[PDB]
Structures are given as structure tokens and as C-alpha cells.
Amino acid sequence: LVPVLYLLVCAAGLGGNTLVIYVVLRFAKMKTVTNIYILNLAVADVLYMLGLPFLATQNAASFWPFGPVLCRLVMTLDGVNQFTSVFCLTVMSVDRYLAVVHPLSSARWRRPRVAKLASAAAWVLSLCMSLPLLVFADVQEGGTCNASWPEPVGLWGAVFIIYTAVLGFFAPLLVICLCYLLIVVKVRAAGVRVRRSERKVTRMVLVLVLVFAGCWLPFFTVNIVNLAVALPQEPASAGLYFFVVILSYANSCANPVLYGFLSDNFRQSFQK
Amino acid sequence: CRNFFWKTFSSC
Amino acid sequence: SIAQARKLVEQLKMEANIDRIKVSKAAADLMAYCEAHAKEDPLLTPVPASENPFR
Amino acid sequence: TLSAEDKAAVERSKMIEKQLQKDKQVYRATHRLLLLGADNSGKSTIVKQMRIRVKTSGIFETKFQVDKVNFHMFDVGAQRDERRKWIQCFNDVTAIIFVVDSSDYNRLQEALNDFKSIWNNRWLRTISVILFLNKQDLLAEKVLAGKSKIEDYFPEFARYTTPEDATPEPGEDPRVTRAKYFIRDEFLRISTASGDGRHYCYPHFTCSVDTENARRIFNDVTDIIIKMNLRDCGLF
Amino acid sequence: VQLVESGGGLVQPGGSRKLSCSASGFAFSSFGMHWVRQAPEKGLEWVAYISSGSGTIYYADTVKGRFTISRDDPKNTLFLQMTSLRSEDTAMYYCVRSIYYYGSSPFDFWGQGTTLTVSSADIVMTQATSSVPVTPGESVSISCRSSKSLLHSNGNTYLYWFLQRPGQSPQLLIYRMSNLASGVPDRFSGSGSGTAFTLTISRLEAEDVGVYYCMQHLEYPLTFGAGTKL
Amino acid sequence: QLRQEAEQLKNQIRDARKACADATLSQITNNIDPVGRIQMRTRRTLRGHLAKIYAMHWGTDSRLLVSASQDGKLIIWDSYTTNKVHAIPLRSSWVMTCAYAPSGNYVACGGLDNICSIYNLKTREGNVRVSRELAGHTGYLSCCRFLDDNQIVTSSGDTTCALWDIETGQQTTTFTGHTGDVMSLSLAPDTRLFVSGACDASAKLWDVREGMCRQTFTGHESDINAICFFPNGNAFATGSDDATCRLFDLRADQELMTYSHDNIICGITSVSFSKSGRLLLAGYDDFNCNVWDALKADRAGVLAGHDNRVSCLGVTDDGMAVATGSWDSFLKIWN
């Protein structure tokens, strides 16, 4: 059942993010830049996870019992959390690239103050990108919480979808892929000069990039196809929409472990 | 009629 | 060596004859000394924030 | 608020902090190395070829540079030959270099024990060890001579063979290759016994006259620093 | 420690002239430099100050704008560039070093100076006693008053005493109203209540003859007393 | 042949020491009121060192402190306002100990190099310069302490301590009783006698003028890393790798008390008493400092403001605060 699976995913992600946030703040620490980025990513992931039950209720029955007040707030919170989680992933990739390929030249940038500034900038960017939904959407139209643009509804929604899909997947994915690919070159060359380390690095990088792609791409591709061509009727392919939605949520669900427990240092701190 | 704009079904 | 053994024996002989005090008396004296300066110990007896220079 | 002289004191403190900041850049750029080994290990030979002060000196500093990369190699001078105390000073060094004479079959066990004690030290867990099997010329001449057999000191050598991964130099006799890889692997077994992935071993074969040691150390230090950065980033 | 300054001369009114102050024998880069001038028949007067790092710079209002202070730490030289020189600017200029840290002794060394000839919230220092007849072997007390208490909340009473022997530059006697500068006889001592100050010269000696100048360092616009001549 | 007499004397020493065991410190002082929970907070956070903090010492003014790091530099700190007073580069980057002269005019430090050089804080040149170098030792300098502006006592790993005259730079007298590296040294309040701990698991009482061992106290089972004189001068506490702190008395010739806990399985780096001596502040390898009551022998408090090993700890002459230096390159003052 769709709501039951949504609740399962929400619980799994909530547990993972709660565990990650505990460690950084208590057992491990947050003086480290990597810990700061991991904590910000976990916070973003849990805030994004808080929105699953609302959407599950909204889709199980074609109605929005929560009223107009929560109609705007839940949607804007979800958008902000998605954008800031993508930005946190990009910032983590950039920091890893700077540390690995430019360990000395990146001394100015790899400081706690700079990490906090980057997190704040990402949050501000997420707020700015979510502003249109907060203002120009979520009236519920007496039905379900969706955008209500000015009279040129087709153009406004299309442009919104285009820009959201770009800055939340395409530039982030390209930057992440470039940063991870550049890192492997350094490790491979170092190994050649002197292969468990190179194998581990390659496997970790491939897991990260493949997981990111598999989780969000289905969602934005469906959104783009919806605009280009009319999708099947209401009952033909209703499930696939929320299937891609939950698969996108799977990204935030899997984030805590990929950048958390899999890291050798985090595990070491968590092990008391 | 139904449509899927961002994350949920929309009534026409 | 012979010289090292002689030196060790001489050092032990010199130290072995040193005067000693009953442990109870020394402990009582230490306790009395600690009691004497109880009020003059900022860590043991915290003093007002105004006097505290590190604030 | 602050008095007139307090402002000047704060300005001086800021200037001193700025001076410290410049010193930090050199500190990270500079790589510190620790040199260890027995008297027969031939540490002096490696210390020599420094192409790039006091009778009772307790420590010596060696400075050499490769490709604009500064390496500081440290050798302990006048000490009571006990290391478990002052070794705590070298808990943040980039790497430890351990030189051994492959030729002295009698003192190989002493070198193995020295390596094991260093490797298992609780204060050197995060520091990798670079192993130089120095004076392979004497090992080649001795094996080739046949006057002495490693079997007398290492009975397992009677049933050991050179692994397929071996890359012996052209013209080397198979006996020399067998002995060389037997030693390296004897050292690796200690290296692999408790490495746990935190620190690794970098075996190399060196002669009393070899100019490639600088580049070997450069490669080893680069690999060690890259692995450390990967661990810090959480990708390792 | 040695400070030699040059660049003095005669300048017509409205002219421009540049002073120089070269230091040697100590770390010039670590000492802030001050300019103090004395008119032919007057006391000391603060002119300008440049910190060790040249970050904080202050000027006297009487020469505000006209005087600008520059230094060359690599060359261990301290400059004073002056423009639109007026009649009042005629005075002998002394460059004085200063290093500021806990327990420091600012104004510890003074240069010989250079003569220049030209063709209200600041704390005012009062020194009523222009001169006092004294004899060897006796004790004489020199007292001065300040319009505002120099005792800052940190617990320091920023008072400085300077002695200027005839034909010689001022020399610091006491700083912070209690501490005695190195090289000064132990018989020199002073005290104050924060607004009334006293300097006592016990066992006066023929070498003690001179003018005693008091200075306050609570605020950057330093002011000097009238001076007592013994 | 001679060893036969040595056993007789060693048995004699135990018999006399045992005969004086009238009552343990616990029994006599059991009735005193408990010290209670002592809570301290980081009043000042000192940062700036490039490498790990190895040793620090407080000046007589209770305001200025000297901190030693293996980055090769000594920094003088204005504790009240965090201002840095001086920055002294060090020719040897592995300095292991530092000292602050009582007059505030000189600072000494040493390390793996066999020289504990003296640095003059107050010179008319305006910058700190080396005034003398003491190169008589054949081992790493582990602790150097001043008896006067002309005399400094030093300890090194060669198992021998030396007393130096700064004016001439020569060893006036040599101490050679220990069989292992000397790790700690502390002067008596009157500077007449000093105690040092070595890796032989024993602490010996030394006379500066006589240059002889007045008393010996084995006590521990492993190396002794720290030692501090009791304020009255009749006792001293020691820190060792055996994870237990032992208190000894020069009058009773016995260990007064042992401070240990089950949860502690790591060695001690530093030990120091409060001004009144009721509190013993000690450093531990587990990144935290535990406060022990000198009499009750119970955990009064724990300081866990450091993320790396604590190597040095010292109390101000006025007992107003205690500084903790750790390998994380930060020094924190607690009160």
C-alpha cells in the first residue's frame, strides 16, 4: 500500500538522520568541517523527511484536510529542504575536491567559518528558490495543493519547472561528477607512481554518483515529460508519479549512511 | 481531468 | 661492577639511617595545613565573580 | 572599553597572530620524516648524498628537497638507546623510515623485532612505515657466494619460493631474488599482521649508492598524505 | 639603543620640509614611534604617532592634516612630512620609540632631536610649580594635577615622568605612576591618588638638576605638564 | 658478596617504613567533610600554536604563562586578556619542557636536543634573544626548572640531572642515582630540595647543595611522568603510566594515599595541587583532566574541554585558575 510504504520510508530516513545528528553533536564533534557539512546535510534530510506524511495523506485520498495554512508551509518547507540538501551534497563534493586535489591551496577555504558560511548561503538559496511556491502557489483550489500561476499558467509553470530541475539536478550533478572524477585521477596517478585504496575510492565514488542519479532523475524526467507531452489518463499511470516521488525521497533516506557510517572516521567516533 | 505539476496530482 | 655495588650499598646505608615520623602525625599535620588555607583556595572555595579576574 | 595601551597590546597580539599564520603555511608544506635503524642498518649512507653541530647533540636534522617539496629527515643522536619515551614526540610525523641490512642474517631477527615493536607502538598507529632494505649488493654477493645459507637462521626459507608478483632486475640470479623477496615478505607479514588499514608499509630495495631514494621517499610521502586526506574527507 | 634624527633647518612661512629619524641597535619594527616637539621656551608637546605595524596613526589637532607620518621598516627609518609650515611650528622635534605590552616601559628612549626654525576634551595637565630651589642631600617633592582621573578601569594609572637635562633629550623616570624605569637610581619614586600625583627625589644629586615633565597616556591625544625646573 | 648487604639494607628500609604505618591517610581523615563536586569552566581559550602543546608554566605574576609546542616556538600569553606578549622561535623544533623565571626576566626550554637554552625576556634590544646554552646533557631534556636568575636545574633522559650556573654555563653538581630516564622535576617552596620521577617506577629526594639522594620512594609499577611538590613541602604527588596517582611524604617515608578509579586505564601526563593543597589536578591520556581530593581520595570533578591528549597542567601561585594544554594546540584556563 502506498501510504504504508511512504511511512516506512519516512521512518527509515528519520531514524538515520536522527542517528547521524546525534553523533556529530555529542559523541563525535563539529569542529571539523566534514562534520559540519554532514550535520547540515542530515538536518536538511530530516526536514525534507518531515513532509512525507502530508503528501501521503494528500495522495491516498484526493483531498487536502490540512487547510490552506499548512498548504503553503508544507510545500515551501519541502522545496527548501530539497534544494538545500542538493546544495549540501554539492558543497560536500566541492570540499572533498579542494581537500584532495588542492590540499595546500585550499587552506583558506577549509575552515569552520567558511563551511558555516557555505551552509548559510545554501540555505538562503533554497529559501529564494522556494519563494515562488510560497507566494504563487499552494491555494489548494479547493482540491489539492498545487501551483496557481497568473493567467499564462502554461508558461509560468513550465519556466518554474525548468529552472527548478536545472539548479536542483543538472548543475549539481555536473559539478559533483566533475569533482569526483577529478579526485579519482589523483588517487589513480598516486597509486601508479608507487590497489585496495584505489579500488575502494572508485567503488565509493561510483556508488555515490549512481545512487544520486537513480534516485532523483526519475522525478525530474517525469516532470519534464509531463510538460512536453500529455501523460496517460488519470487511472492508467497514477502510481508512477508517487513512485518516482518516493524514489526521490530515497535519496535523502540513503544520504545519512553514504556520507555517515560508510566514512571511516565517523564510524570510529560513533564506536565510542 | 488530472495533472501532476510538482509532487502531487492536480485537479485539471 | 664492584665500585657500583659499593656505591649502592653506601647510598642505602646513608639513607636507611635517616629519621622518620609516624605516618599518623604527618597525615594530621597535612590535614591541619589544608584546613588552615581552606578560605584562600579559589578553586576549592569559589569566590565572587567581581573578584574573579577571569570573567 | 579598552585603554590606550590595551589597544596597542591588542594590535601587537594581532601582528603576532599574523606572524604565526605565515609560519603555519610552511609547517603544512614541510614534510617531517623520522629515520630509525641499527648501526649496521646504514642510516648514514641514506643521510649522505644530501644533494637537495654539537658533540652531545641529541637529535640531527637533515634537509633535502625534491621538485620544490621540502622534506625534513630527523635522526636521533646522543641518547640512552631507549625509545618508548621520546618516541611520543613523533606522533604527528608524516612517515617513519626504517633501514635494515638484508645481508646480516644473524641481525635480521633483531631488525624484525625492532620493526614489530615500532609497528605495534600505540603512539605510532596513524604513522606509516617506509622500509628500505639497504645494502642489497652485499646480499647478492653473499647468496651468490654460497658460503652462508639463510636456512640456518630462517628454517622456513628452505620451503619458500619467489612469488609471481616479483620483478627482479635483469641478470639477477634466482637465489638472490628468492632471498630478497623472502626478506621483504618476512617484513610484510609483520606489516600485514595488524595494519588494519590505518597505516601501511612501503618496502623498497636500496643500495649504499643509490640516488633514487629521494624519489622513492617522495612517492611514499605523497601516497601517505593522499591517503590521510582521503580518510579525513571520509571517502576512505 | 640609538636614535639619530636629521632634517632640521630654516623654512619660510607656508613652506614644506621633511624630517627623518633613523634607528639602530634594536628592533625598530617592534617599537611604535612618537613625535614630541619643544618650543624654545616651552614644554613638550605631542605631534604624531605610528604603531609598530603602521596600522593605528594619530595626530595632534594643532598639526592635524599638515603633518603626516610615514616609516620604512626595511630601512629602519621614521619620517615626518610637513606642509604649509606656520610660525607656531618652530620647535625642536624628538622621535621617541614605544613598545606596548603588559609590563612594558613606553617612551624608554629619546633621541637628541632636530631643531626646526620658521622665518578641548583632551586632558589638561597642571603643574603650578614652575621652579623650586633645591640643595644636595635634601628631598624635594614635585606634584602635579590632572583634569580627569588617569586611573582606568583596568587598574593602571597612566602617568609618565620625564627628566630633560640641559643640552640633552628628555629621559623617562617613572611610568604608570609607580614603576621605575631601568637604569634610573632607586632613590627616584613617585605616587598619586589618580588625579593628584607626586614625584619624590630622595637624596638629590648634582646630576638631578633639570626639568621634570609629566605625561598622561590614558587617551591618545597626549598632553604634558608645564614642567618643574630644579 | 656486596649484594648480600644490599638485601639486608633493603629489608631494613621496609621494616622501618612498615613500623611507622600507624594508620592510613584514609582512616585518620575519614571524618572530614567531603570536598563535594567542584565545577570549573573554560574562562579563557588560548589558541594559535601550530603543533601539540607539550609543556607550560605559570609566572610568579599569576597573569603571564609560557606554553611549549613541538612546532618550534614559545609564546608568552596575557592570560587576563588573551593578548600575546612575545613570540620566540626555537632552533630545535622538538622542545619538551619550558620554564618561567620567578623574576620574569628569563625563560628556558629544551627537548630532544640536549640543550635547555635560556631566553631573555627583557633586553634593551626589544626582542627575545638566547643568553646561554646548556649542552652538558647526553639525552633529551625532559624538565628544566629555575632556582634563581643564575641557577637552573635540568632533567634529561640520560638518567642524570644537572645543576647549572647561567653565568658560566657549567654543571656545578650532577645527580646520577636513577637507573632510567627522568621525566619530571619540581622544586620545593624554599628551593632547597627537589623531587624527580623517572621510568624506574621510583621517585627520589635530591639536595641541591649536597647533591645526594636524601630519600627514595619506589611506589609505582611503571614509569613516572609527572611530580609536584605539596605547598607545605612535606609531601609530593606523582603521576605514572600505571593509571594511579600516588602521594608520598618526606617525613613518614611512605605512600600516604593512592588516587585511582576503575574507569581509568590510561597513564597520567601531569599533576598539580591547588593553592591550599586540598585538590590535586592531574592530566590523563583519555583527553580529560580529573580533580582528586587530596585527603578523601575521591573524584571531585572532571574537565573534558580538550579533544586531544593533555600533556601539561599548572595552577597559578594565587590558585585563581588552572591551565590545561593539549595536543590539539589549544590551552584552556579553568576556574
PDB file of N, CA and C in Angstrom, chain A residues 62-128:
ATOM      1  N   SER A  62      -7.956  12.024  -2.708  1.00  0.00           N
ATOM      2  CA  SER A  62      -7.791  13.259  -3.463  1.00  0.00           C
ATOM      3  C   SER A  62      -8.377  14.434  -2.691  1.00  0.00           C
ATOM      4  N   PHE A  63      -7.734  14.806  -1.586  1.00  0.00           N
ATOM      5  CA  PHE A  63      -8.201  15.914  -0.765  1.00  0.00           C
ATOM      6  C   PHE A  63      -7.060  16.360   0.137  1.00  0.00           C
ATOM      7  N   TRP A  64      -7.187  17.583   0.659  1.00  0.00           N
ATOM      8  CA  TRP A  64      -6.166  18.213   1.493  1.00  0.00           C
ATOM      9  C   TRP A  64      -6.816  18.665   2.798  1.00  0.00           C
ATOM     10  N   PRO A  65      -6.970  17.759   3.769  1.00  0.00           N
ATOM     11  CA  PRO A  65      -7.651  18.135   5.021  1.00  0.00           C
ATOM     12  C   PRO A  65      -6.939  19.217   5.812  1.00  0.00           C
ATOM     13  N   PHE A  66      -5.647  19.441   5.577  1.00  0.00           N
ATOM     14  CA  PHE A  66      -4.854  20.323   6.425  1.00  0.00           C
ATOM     15  C   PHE A  66      -5.219  21.795   6.274  1.00  0.00           C
ATOM     16  N   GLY A  67      -5.975  22.164   5.245  1.00  0.00           N
ATOM     17  CA  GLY A  67      -6.386  23.535   5.059  1.00  0.00           C
ATOM     18  C   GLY A  67      -5.338  24.364   4.343  1.00  0.00           C
ATOM     19  N   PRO A  68      -5.638  25.647   4.123  1.00  0.00           N
ATOM     20  CA  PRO A  68      -4.706  26.489   3.357  1.00  0.00           C
ATOM     21  C   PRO A  68      -3.458  26.884   4.127  1.00  0.00           C
ATOM     22  N   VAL A  69      -3.532  26.996   5.455  1.00  0.00           N
ATOM     23  CA  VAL A  69      -2.381  27.469   6.221  1.00  0.00           C
ATOM     24  C   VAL A  69      -1.202  26.517   6.051  1.00  0.00           C
ATOM     25  N   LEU A  70      -1.437  25.219   6.255  1.00  0.00           N
ATOM     26  CA  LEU A  70      -0.378  24.236   6.062  1.00  0.00           C
ATOM     27  C   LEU A  70      -0.100  23.977   4.588  1.00  0.00           C
ATOM     28  N   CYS A  71      -1.047  24.315   3.711  1.00  0.00           N
ATOM     29  CA  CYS A  71      -0.872  24.090   2.279  1.00  0.00           C
ATOM     30  C   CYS A  71       0.393  24.771   1.769  1.00  0.00           C
ATOM     31  N   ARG A  72       0.578  26.046   2.118  1.00  0.00           N
ATOM     32  CA  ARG A  72       1.779  26.763   1.699  1.00  0.00           C
ATOM     33  C   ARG A  72       3.007  26.280   2.461  1.00  0.00           C
ATOM     34  N   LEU A  73       2.873  26.109   3.778  1.00  0.00           N
ATOM     35  CA  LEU A  73       4.033  25.861   4.626  1.00  0.00           C
ATOM     36  C   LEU A  73       4.688  24.528   4.295  1.00  0.00           C
ATOM     37  N   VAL A  74       3.890  23.471   4.139  1.00  0.00           N
ATOM     38  CA  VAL A  74       4.467  22.158   3.874  1.00  0.00           C
ATOM     39  C   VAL A  74       5.196  22.160   2.537  1.00  0.00           C
ATOM     40  N   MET A  75       4.580  22.749   1.510  1.00  0.00           N
ATOM     41  CA  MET A  75       5.195  22.765   0.186  1.00  0.00           C
ATOM     42  C   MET A  75       6.492  23.564   0.195  1.00  0.00           C
ATOM     43  N   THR A  76       6.480  24.747   0.817  1.00  0.00           N
ATOM     44  CA  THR A  76       7.690  25.563   0.833  1.00  0.00           C
ATOM     45  C   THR A  76       8.791  24.897   1.648  1.00  0.00           C
ATOM     46  N   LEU A  77       8.439  24.273   2.777  1.00  0.00           N
ATOM     47  CA  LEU A  77       9.436  23.546   3.554  1.00  0.00           C
ATOM     48  C   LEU A  77      10.035  22.406   2.744  1.00  0.00           C
ATOM     49  N   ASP A  78       9.193  21.651   2.034  1.00  0.00           N
ATOM     50  CA  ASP A  78       9.693  20.549   1.219  1.00  0.00           C
ATOM     51  C   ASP A  78      10.649  21.054   0.146  1.00  0.00           C
ATOM     52  N   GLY A  79      10.268  22.129  -0.547  1.00  0.00           N
ATOM     53  CA  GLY A  79      11.140  22.673  -1.575  1.00  0.00           C
ATOM     54  C   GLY A  79      12.460  23.167  -1.015  1.00  0.00           C
ATOM     55  N   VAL A  80      12.408  23.891   0.105  1.00  0.00           N
ATOM     56  CA  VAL A  80      13.630  24.392   0.725  1.00  0.00           C
ATOM     57  C   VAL A  80      14.532  23.235   1.123  1.00  0.00           C
ATOM     58  N   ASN A  81      13.957  22.191   1.725  1.00  0.00           N
ATOM     59  CA  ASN A  81      14.770  21.067   2.173  1.00  0.00           C
ATOM     60  C   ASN A  81      15.402  20.343   0.992  1.00  0.00           C
ATOM     61  N   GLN A  82      14.643  20.140  -0.089  1.00  0.00           N
ATOM     62  CA  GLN A  82      15.212  19.507  -1.275  1.00  0.00           C
ATOM     63  C   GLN A  82      16.374  20.327  -1.828  1.00  0.00           C
ATOM     64  N   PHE A  83      16.150  21.630  -2.026  1.00  0.00           N
ATOM     65  CA  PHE A  83      17.187  22.473  -2.609  1.00  0.00           C
ATOM     66  C   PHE A  83      18.426  22.512  -1.726  1.00  0.00           C
ATOM     67  N   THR A  84      18.241  22.667  -0.412  1.00  0.00           N
ATOM     68  CA  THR A  84      19.391  22.779   0.475  1.00  0.00           C
ATOM     69  C   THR A  84      20.107  21.446   0.636  1.00  0.00           C
ATOM     70  N   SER A  85      19.394  20.321   0.531  1.00  0.00           N
ATOM     71  CA  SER A  85      20.072  19.030   0.539  1.00  0.00           C
ATOM     72  C   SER A  85      20.935  18.858  -0.706  1.00  0.00           C
ATOM     73  N   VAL A  86      20.409  19.237  -1.873  1.00  0.00           N
ATOM     74  CA  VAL A  86      21.222  19.174  -3.087  1.00  0.00           C
ATOM     75  C   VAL A  86      22.435  20.088  -2.950  1.00  0.00           C
ATOM     76  N   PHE A  87      22.231  21.286  -2.398  1.00  0.00           N
ATOM     77  CA  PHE A  87      23.339  22.220  -2.226  1.00  0.00           C
ATOM     78  C   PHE A  87      24.369  21.681  -1.241  1.00  0.00           C
ATOM     79  N   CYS A  88      23.915  21.012  -0.180  1.00  0.00           N
ATOM     80  CA  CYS A  88      24.838  20.412   0.776  1.00  0.00           C
ATOM     81  C   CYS A  88      25.655  19.302   0.129  1.00  0.00           C
ATOM     82  N   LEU A  89      25.021  18.475  -0.703  1.00  0.00           N
ATOM     83  CA  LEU A  89      25.771  17.448  -1.423  1.00  0.00           C
ATOM     84  C   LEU A  89      26.818  18.081  -2.334  1.00  0.00           C
ATOM     85  N   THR A  90      26.438  19.143  -3.051  1.00  0.00           N
ATOM     86  CA  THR A  90      27.395  19.821  -3.920  1.00  0.00           C
ATOM     87  C   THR A  90      28.540  20.428  -3.115  1.00  0.00           C
ATOM     88  N   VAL A  91      28.231  21.029  -1.966  1.00  0.00           N
ATOM     89  CA  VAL A  91      29.269  21.620  -1.127  1.00  0.00           C
ATOM     90  C   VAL A  91      30.205  20.542  -0.600  1.00  0.00           C
ATOM     91  N   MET A  92      29.659  19.382  -0.235  1.00  0.00           N
ATOM     92  CA  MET A  92      30.500  18.279   0.214  1.00  0.00           C
ATOM     93  C   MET A  92      31.437  17.833  -0.900  1.00  0.00           C
ATOM     94  N   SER A  93      30.908  17.708  -2.119  1.00  0.00           N
ATOM     95  CA  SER A  93      31.750  17.318  -3.247  1.00  0.00           C
ATOM     96  C   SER A  93      32.844  18.348  -3.501  1.00  0.00           C
ATOM     97  N   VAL A  94      32.494  19.634  -3.447  1.00  0.00           N
ATOM     98  CA  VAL A  94      33.479  20.686  -3.685  1.00  0.00           C
ATOM     99  C   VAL A  94      34.557  20.658  -2.610  1.00  0.00           C
ATOM    100  N   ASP A  95      34.154  20.493  -1.348  1.00  0.00           N
ATOM    101  CA  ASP A  95      35.123  20.442  -0.260  1.00  0.00           C
ATOM    102  C   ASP A  95      36.048  19.244  -0.409  1.00  0.00           C
ATOM    103  N   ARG A  96      35.494  18.086  -0.776  1.00  0.00           N
ATOM    104  CA  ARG A  96      36.331  16.911  -0.993  1.00  0.00           C
ATOM    105  C   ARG A  96      37.323  17.147  -2.123  1.00  0.00           C
ATOM    106  N   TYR A  97      36.868  17.751  -3.225  1.00  0.00           N
ATOM    107  CA  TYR A  97      37.775  18.038  -4.333  1.00  0.00           C
ATOM    108  C   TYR A  97      38.886  18.986  -3.903  1.00  0.00           C
ATOM    109  N   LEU A  98      38.535  20.051  -3.179  1.00  0.00           N
ATOM    110  CA  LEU A  98      39.547  21.006  -2.742  1.00  0.00           C
ATOM    111  C   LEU A  98      40.552  20.349  -1.807  1.00  0.00           C
ATOM    112  N   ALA A  99      40.073  19.523  -0.876  1.00  0.00           N
ATOM    113  CA  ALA A  99      40.975  18.876   0.070  1.00  0.00           C
ATOM    114  C   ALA A  99      41.895  17.883  -0.625  1.00  0.00           C
ATOM    115  N   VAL A 100      41.357  17.085  -1.549  1.00  0.00           N
ATOM    116  CA  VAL A 100      42.138  16.003  -2.141  1.00  0.00           C
ATOM    117  C   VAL A 100      43.092  16.538  -3.201  1.00  0.00           C
ATOM    118  N   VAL A 101      42.584  17.339  -4.136  1.00  0.00           N
ATOM    119  CA  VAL A 101      43.410  17.795  -5.247  1.00  0.00           C
ATOM    120  C   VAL A 101      44.203  19.052  -4.897  1.00  0.00           C
ATOM    121  N   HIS A 102      43.685  19.894  -4.005  1.00  0.00           N
ATOM    122  CA  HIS A 102      44.338  21.145  -3.619  1.00  0.00           C
ATOM    123  C   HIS A 102      44.460  21.205  -2.101  1.00  0.00           C
ATOM    124  N   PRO A 103      45.204  20.274  -1.502  1.00  0.00           N
ATOM    125  CA  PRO A 103      45.305  20.260  -0.033  1.00  0.00           C
ATOM    126  C   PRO A 103      45.929  21.516   0.544  1.00  0.00           C
ATOM    127  N   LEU A 104      46.860  22.144  -0.175  1.00  0.00           N
ATOM    128  CA  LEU A 104      47.556  23.325   0.321  1.00  0.00           C
ATOM    129  C   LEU A 104      46.866  24.615  -0.113  1.00  0.00           C
ATOM    130  N   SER A 105      46.513  24.718  -1.395  1.00  0.00           N
ATOM    131  CA  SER A 105      45.867  25.923  -1.900  1.00  0.00           C
ATOM    132  C   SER A 105      44.488  26.143  -1.289  1.00  0.00           C
ATOM    133  N   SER A 106      43.880  25.105  -0.716  1.00  0.00           N
ATOM    134  CA  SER A 106      42.546  25.192  -0.141  1.00  0.00           C
ATOM    135  C   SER A 106      42.570  25.462   1.359  1.00  0.00           C
ATOM    136  N   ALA A 107      43.718  25.863   1.908  1.00  0.00           N
ATOM    137  CA  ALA A 107      43.800  26.113   3.342  1.00  0.00           C
ATOM    138  C   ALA A 107      42.873  27.242   3.772  1.00  0.00           C
ATOM    139  N   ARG A 108      42.736  28.282   2.947  1.00  0.00           N
ATOM    140  CA  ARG A 108      41.857  29.392   3.296  1.00  0.00           C
ATOM    141  C   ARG A 108      40.398  28.955   3.340  1.00  0.00           C
ATOM    142  N   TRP A 109      39.986  28.101   2.402  1.00  0.00           N
ATOM    143  CA  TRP A 109      38.578  27.748   2.258  1.00  0.00           C
ATOM    144  C   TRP A 109      38.126  26.656   3.218  1.00  0.00           C
ATOM    145  N   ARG A 110      39.027  25.769   3.640  1.00  0.00           N
ATOM    146  CA  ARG A 110      38.655  24.648   4.504  1.00  0.00           C
ATOM    147  C   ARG A 110      38.824  25.049   5.971  1.00  0.00           C
ATOM    148  N   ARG A 111      37.919  25.915   6.415  1.00  0.00           N
ATOM    149  CA  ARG A 111      37.847  26.348   7.800  1.00  0.00           C
ATOM    150  C   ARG A 111      36.403  26.304   8.277  1.00  0.00           C
ATOM    151  N   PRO A 112      36.181  26.163   9.590  1.00  0.00           N
ATOM    152  CA  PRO A 112      34.794  26.068  10.080  1.00  0.00           C
ATOM    153  C   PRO A 112      33.937  27.263   9.703  1.00  0.00           C
ATOM    154  N   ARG A 113      34.502  28.472   9.754  1.00  0.00           N
ATOM    155  CA  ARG A 113      33.731  29.657   9.398  1.00  0.00           C
ATOM    156  C   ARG A 113      33.298  29.609   7.940  1.00  0.00           C
ATOM    157  N   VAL A 114      34.199  29.189   7.048  1.00  0.00           N
ATOM    158  CA  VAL A 114      33.857  29.103   5.631  1.00  0.00           C
ATOM    159  C   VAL A 114      32.797  28.033   5.403  1.00  0.00           C
ATOM    160  N   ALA A 115      32.895  26.910   6.118  1.00  0.00           N
ATOM    161  CA  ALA A 115      31.882  25.866   5.991  1.00  0.00           C
ATOM    162  C   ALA A 115      30.513  26.367   6.434  1.00  0.00           C
ATOM    163  N   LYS A 116      30.461  27.069   7.568  1.00  0.00           N
ATOM    164  CA  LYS A 116      29.193  27.613   8.041  1.00  0.00           C
ATOM    165  C   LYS A 116      28.652  28.655   7.070  1.00  0.00           C
ATOM    166  N   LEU A 117      29.535  29.479   6.503  1.00  0.00           N
ATOM    167  CA  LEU A 117      29.108  30.460   5.510  1.00  0.00           C
ATOM    168  C   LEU A 117      28.526  29.776   4.278  1.00  0.00           C
ATOM    169  N   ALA A 118      29.164  28.698   3.820  1.00  0.00           N
ATOM    170  CA  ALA A 118      28.641  27.958   2.676  1.00  0.00           C
ATOM    171  C   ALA A 118      27.276  27.359   2.988  1.00  0.00           C
ATOM    172  N   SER A 119      27.117  26.795   4.187  1.00  0.00           N
ATOM    173  CA  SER A 119      25.823  26.239   4.568  1.00  0.00           C
ATOM    174  C   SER A 119      24.750  27.322   4.607  1.00  0.00           C
ATOM    175  N   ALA A 120      25.082  28.489   5.166  1.00  0.00           N
ATOM    176  CA  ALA A 120      24.121  29.586   5.218  1.00  0.00           C
ATOM    177  C   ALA A 120      23.758  30.065   3.819  1.00  0.00           C
ATOM    178  N   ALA A 121      24.743  30.148   2.924  1.00  0.00           N
ATOM    179  CA  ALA A 121      24.460  30.548   1.550  1.00  0.00           C
ATOM    180  C   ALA A 121      23.552  29.536   0.864  1.00  0.00           C
ATOM    181  N   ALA A 122      23.802  28.244   1.086  1.00  0.00           N
ATOM    182  CA  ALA A 122      22.943  27.215   0.512  1.00  0.00           C
ATOM    183  C   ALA A 122      21.519  27.340   1.036  1.00  0.00           C
ATOM    184  N   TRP A 123      21.372  27.584   2.340  1.00  0.00           N
ATOM    185  CA  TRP A 123      20.040  27.739   2.915  1.00  0.00           C
ATOM    186  C   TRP A 123      19.328  28.964   2.347  1.00  0.00           C
ATOM    187  N   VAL A 124      20.048  30.077   2.200  1.00  0.00           N
ATOM    188  CA  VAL A 124      19.448  31.277   1.625  1.00  0.00           C
ATOM    189  C   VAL A 124      19.015  31.013   0.190  1.00  0.00           C
ATOM    190  N   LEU A 125      19.848  30.300  -0.572  1.00  0.00           N
ATOM    191  CA  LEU A 125      19.494  29.970  -1.948  1.00  0.00           C
ATOM    192  C   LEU A 125      18.252  29.089  -2.000  1.00  0.00           C
ATOM    193  N   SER A 126      18.155  28.118  -1.089  1.00  0.00           N
ATOM    194  CA  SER A 126      16.968  27.273  -1.037  1.00  0.00           C
ATOM    195  C   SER A 126      15.726  28.093  -0.715  1.00  0.00           C
ATOM    196  N   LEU A 127      15.836  29.017   0.241  1.00  0.00           N
ATOM    197  CA  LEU A 127      14.705  29.884   0.563  1.00  0.00           C
ATOM    198  C   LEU A 127      14.285  30.698  -0.654  1.00  0.00           C
ATOM    199  N   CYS A 128      15.259  31.278  -1.357  1.00  0.00           N
ATOM    200  CA  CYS A 128      14.941  32.093  -2.525  1.00  0.00           C
ATOM    201  C   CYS A 128      14.261  31.264  -3.605  1.00  0.00           C
TER     202      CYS A 128
END
